[PDB]
């Protein structure tokens, strides 16, 4: 009974998301070391200390969806992997959304976005596991609604973590019927 509205990993990086600032913040990457290609948005500016990097989805038409479920899969590297990053490095990132009736296109205005939650890893990836290609994939799900406008965006804010976002799946549950 689920209807999928957005599926980053299945789209092969063709979804055309928006980054702000463009360049040096979140970057679209692929890993092809495994059976299935892996796609991701990732950032790792853990030494600077003044990071405010944003990632916004394409516009998603809501249709009949009222409550939307947002499933994220991601890795976070241990801040202790980076020497002298005690104050600059973080281990969380933030999830936001915005409802709208039109597509704003390339105009990203973070002032229109509402925070859903801080997203934190149950498992951090330490250096030895990173170097051996054994990353720890975390899964976090949140829901919001009822939605009331024609469409919505999700956005992701990085504040100085070493984070790879590998899956973003948004779905709703079809109305229950009495057989």
């Amino acid at each position: 009974g689920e209807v999928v509205l957005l599926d980053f990993a299945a789209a092969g990086g063709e979804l055309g998301w928006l980054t702000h600032p463009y360049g040096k913040g979140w970057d679209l990457m692929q890993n092809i070391m495994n059976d299935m290609p892996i796609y991701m948005y990732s950032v790792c500016n853990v030494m600077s200390g003044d990071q405010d990097n944003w990632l916004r989805t394409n516009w998603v038409y809501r249709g009949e969806a009222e409550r939307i479920f947002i499933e994220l899969k991601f890795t976070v590297r241990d801040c202790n992997s980076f020497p002298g990053g005690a104050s600059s490095c973080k281990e969380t990132f933030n999830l936001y959304y915005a409802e709208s009736d039109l597509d704003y296109g390339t105009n990203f205005q973070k002032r229109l976005f509402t925070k859903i939650d801080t997203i934190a890893p149950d498992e951090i990836t330490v250096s030895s596991d990173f170097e051996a290609r054994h990353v720890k994939l975390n899964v976090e799900e949140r829901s919001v609604g009822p939605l009331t406008r024609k469409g919505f965006y999700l956005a992701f804010q990085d504040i100085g973590a070493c984070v790879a976002l590998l899956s973003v799946r948004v779905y709703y549950k079809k109305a229950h019927h009495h057989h």
Binding site: G13, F130, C162, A164, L166
Partner: peptide, 10 residues
């Protein structure tokens, strides 16, 4: 530093 091993820009 990199967030994910063997990742290459698209």
């Amino acid at each position: 530093y990199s967030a994910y091993p063997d990742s290459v820009p698209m």
